[PDB]
Amino acid sequence: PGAAEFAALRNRWVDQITGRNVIQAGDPDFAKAITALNNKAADSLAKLDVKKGRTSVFTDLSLAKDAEMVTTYTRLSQLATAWATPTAAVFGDAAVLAAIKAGLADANTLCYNDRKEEVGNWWSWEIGVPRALADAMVLLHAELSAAERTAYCAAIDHFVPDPWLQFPPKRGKITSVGANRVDLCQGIIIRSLAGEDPTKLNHAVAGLSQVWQYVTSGDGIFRDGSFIQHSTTPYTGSYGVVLLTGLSKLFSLLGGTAFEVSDPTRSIFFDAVEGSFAPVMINGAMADAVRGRSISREANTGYDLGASAIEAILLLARAMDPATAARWRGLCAGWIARDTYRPILNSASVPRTALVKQLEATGVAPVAEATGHKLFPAMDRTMHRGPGWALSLALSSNRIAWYECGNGENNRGYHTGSGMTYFYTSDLGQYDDAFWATANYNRLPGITVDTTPLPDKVEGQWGAAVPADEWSGATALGEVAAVGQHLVGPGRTGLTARKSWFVSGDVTVCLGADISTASGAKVETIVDHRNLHQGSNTLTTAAGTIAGTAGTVEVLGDGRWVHLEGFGGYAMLDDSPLHVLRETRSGSWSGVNINGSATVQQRNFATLYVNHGVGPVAGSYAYMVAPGASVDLTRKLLEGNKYSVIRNDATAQSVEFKTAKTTAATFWKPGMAGDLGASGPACVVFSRHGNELSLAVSEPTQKAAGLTLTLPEGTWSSVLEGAGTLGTDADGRSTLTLDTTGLSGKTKLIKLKR
Numbered sequence: 001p002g003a004a005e006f007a008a009l010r011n012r013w014v015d016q017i018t019g020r021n022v023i024q025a026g027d028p029d030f031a032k033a034i035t036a037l038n039n040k041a042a043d044s045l046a047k048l049d050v051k052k053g054r055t056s057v058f059t060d061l062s063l064a065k066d067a068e069m070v071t072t073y074t075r076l077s078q079l080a081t082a083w084a085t086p087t088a089a090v091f092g093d094a095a096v097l098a099a100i101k102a103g104l105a106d107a108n109t110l111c112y113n114d115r116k117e118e119v120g121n122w123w124s125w126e127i128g129v130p131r132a133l134a135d136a137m138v139l140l141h142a143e144l145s146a147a148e149r150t151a152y153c154a155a156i157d158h159f160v161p162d163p164w165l166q167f168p169p170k171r172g173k174i175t176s177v178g179a180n181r182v183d184l185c186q187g188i189i190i191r192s193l194a195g196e197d198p199t200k201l202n203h204a205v206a207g208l209s210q211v212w213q214y215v216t217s218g219d220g221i222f223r224d225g226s227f228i229q230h231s232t233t234p235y236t237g238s239y240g241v242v243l244l245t246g247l248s249k250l251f252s253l254l255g256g257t258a259f260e261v262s263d264p265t266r267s268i269f270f271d272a273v274e275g276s277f278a279p280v281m282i283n284g285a286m287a288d289a290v291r292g293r294s295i296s297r298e299a300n301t302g303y304d305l306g307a308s309a310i311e312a313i314l315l316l317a318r319a320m321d322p323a324t325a326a327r328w329r330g331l332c333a334g335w336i337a338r339d340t341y342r343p344i345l346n347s348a349s350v351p352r353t354a355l356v357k358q359l360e361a362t363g364v365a366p367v368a369e370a371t372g373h374k375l376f377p378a379m380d381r382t383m384h385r386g387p388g389w390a391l392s393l394a395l396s397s398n399r400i401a402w403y404e405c406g407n408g409e410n411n412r413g414y415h416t417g418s419g420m421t422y423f424y425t426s427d428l429g430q431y432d433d434a435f436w437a438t439a440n441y442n443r444l445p446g447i448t449v450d451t452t453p454l455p456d457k458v459e460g461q462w463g464a465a466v467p468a469d470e471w472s473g474a475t476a477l478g479e480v481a482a483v484g485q486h487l488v489g490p491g492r493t494g495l496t497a498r499k500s501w502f503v504s505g506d507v508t509v510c511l512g513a514d515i516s517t518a519s520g521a522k523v524e525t526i527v528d529h530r531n532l533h534q535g536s537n538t539l540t541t542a543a544g545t546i547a548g549t550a551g552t553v554e555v556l557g558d559g560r561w562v563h564l565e566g567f568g569g570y571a572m573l574d575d576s577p578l579h580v581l582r583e584t585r586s587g588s589w590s591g592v593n594i595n596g597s598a599t600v601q602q603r604n605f606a607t608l609y610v611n612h613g614v615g616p617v618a619g620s621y622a623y624m625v626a627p628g629a630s631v632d633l634t635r636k637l638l639e640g641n642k643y644s645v646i647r648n649d650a651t652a653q654s655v656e657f658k659t660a661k662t663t664a665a666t667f668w669k670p671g672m673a674g675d676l677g678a679s680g681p682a683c684v685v686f687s688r689h690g691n692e693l694s695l696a697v698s699e700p701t702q703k704a705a706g707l708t709l710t711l712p713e714g715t716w717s718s719v720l721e722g723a724g725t726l727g728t729d730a731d732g733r734s735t736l737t738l739d740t741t742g743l744s745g746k747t748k749l750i751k752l753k754r
């Protein structure tokens with residue numbers, strides 16, 4: 001491929017990043033996209049350093065600060081984008097063009113050139129600048145000289161001689177992986193279009209192949225659909241999105257050319273659309289539990305990341321077989337249609353607007369989020385859905401860090417892996433509406449927590465430490481899931497707790513046992529900590545109402561249930577006191593992220609908790625949550641033994657769902673929970689239908705070669721579906737012995753016949 005092929009690729013890239021070929025005349029959403037483009041460009045131009053012999057390009061960005069160097073470059077690429085977008089205010093404006101060129105030239109002279117050593121964050125030099133500089137070169141190809149291309153290409157190549165690797169020489173260079181590999185390859189591919197370098201282009205394309213190979217450890221995509229970046233942090237929703245976005249753009253760019261991505265194993269990445277991304281998308285938002293430190297970002301939210309994912313999936317759907325294209329389109333149309341809270345078109349780019357308009361013109365109908373369970377054992381995450389709700393559980397374990405903090409972001413997030421229960425609902429802004437600026441980071445919903453104050457960045461940055469726990473894991477059979485977490489508290493308090501969740505199609509049963517700590521502080525378990533926005537939502541009880549006054553904690557009478565207006569129901573499954581607090585909290589994004597705004601946000605919360613006291617000995621809890629339940633349904637939860645606690649202690653935790661005729665259990669030690677037993681750690685869900693026993697089982701440590709169940713509901717003589725060896729114990733009970741070697745926490749389904 002020569003000059004014409006390179007020109008066509010450059011033109012395609014500019015088409016893609018400007019939407020110049022797809023603007024619909026007189027369309028109001030296109031006009032809005034152009035207005036947003038114009039306002040950003042105007043803002044940057046207003047900040048241009050005009051001074052003779054200038055030492056920065058923008059008056060508010062120092063080239064001596066690597067993040068501000070990146071922003072210098074991304075403003076220049078944005079201005080170049082505007083300059084290249086028909087009907088933009090600065091479209092074809094030669095004065096603006098000259099300013100962009102002089103900015104690229106001076107930033108090169110002053111800072112970013114082939115003689116400069118990296119200072120500060122590697123990512124700035126190797127990903128932030130190259131992608132933006134490469135885009136600017138391509139956008140400005142007709143306008144830059146050969147000498148300018150040589151200079152800029154030389155600078156990029158100096159920092160990124162090989163996009164399969166990362167870090168400056170003084171550090172020792174390592175293999176780039178996941179999102180980082182995609183981003184490095186993007187920068188080199190675009191730079192290779194500007195410089196017409198097929199050798200660099202081919203190598204960078206070949207570099208994409210590693211990112212979608214299945215892994216069983218480290219970073220990447222796991223066969224269960226989990227995605228990890230930074231070794232220990234569930235990351236589908238932020239780094240996984242970066243991967244998704246970059247591959248969408250690169251695949252589209254190269255498709256049909258001499259440089260097309262042709263590796264057939266890319267099927268694994270396509271499989272990840274539904275296997276990895278879709279289950280953690282909730283009405284247009286990526287679940288907070290899979291977006292790591294980005295929760296602390298006021299302007300990189302679950303909806304920002306979900307919108308990027310939707311853009312990427314739409315772009316990839318264009319190349320798919322008809323059935324897959326239509327399925328992906330339907331998924332996106334649903335995530336778009338259900339999201340009235342941050343509509344995707346508000347502040348959308350021209351490209352994003354075009355893809356959304358193209359989707360609408362297909363007439364592909366919106367696909368509903370399926371009810372039921374999606375388990376991700378490799379990343380200690382589970383998702384559960386029923387009509388009107390999605391529960392996301394956030395665990396941690398000897399595989400998965402309590403949290404990621406880094407670069408001044410999420411330093412206070414140390415309890416976010418302590419068994420959080422995120423109940424997403426039609427309150428689309430629950431976790432988005434300054435939740436992370438105002439919430440009590442020591443009382444996050446669902447957690448058990450030692451009230452000892454912890455310092456910012458406790459346990460270290462970048463997920464370097466993980467809890468030395470027994471196990472965290474899950475299984476599910478049909479409409480019921482069993483999830484367990486041995487919580488080890490961060491900050492060496494010695495907090496220990498056994499937390500389990502038993503999740504049906506409607507209600508979540510939450511059991512806790514064996515709770516103690518070494519710190520001498522009180523331990524709490526948080527039934528909920530729920531953003532009311534500016535509302536005064538009523539907490540109804542058997543007797544009347546509770547916590548009507550902000551700031552005065554009250555203890556629930558003895559009816560055992562509370563209903564929160566606009567949410568649903570909570571009910572206690574033991575006789576423990578339920579403390580109920582209506583509170584107003586304040587905070588700024590700057591308190592949770594070094595880049596956050598100083599603006600103070602003020603939010604109302606309902607805070608429901610159990611207090612285990614000081615020095616608990618085998619403390620425990622038992623309660624349920626019924627999202628979307630009416631006051632009348634709430635009042636009835638505890639009637640008729642619908643949610644039958646079987647056992648809740650240091651050996652096992654188990655509940656039977658009466659209506660569903662299904663029983664769920666977690667096992668910590670060998671023993672029995674009712675008529676079900678296990679020989680070691682296990683998650684089990686079972687249900688008898690006449691003369692047939694259905695079971696789901698996981699071995700949640702991920703390290704045991706075998707597991708033996710002692711079977712419920714009488715004797716069982718043959719295996720109908722699945723694998724396993726039937727036996728008989730000393731007491732005459734049927735046993736099922738499973739080979740669990742290498743199962744990585746995955747579920748085995750078994751059906752037995754009487």
Ligand code: NA
Nearest residue numbers: 230232462463
């Ligand atoms: Na890590």
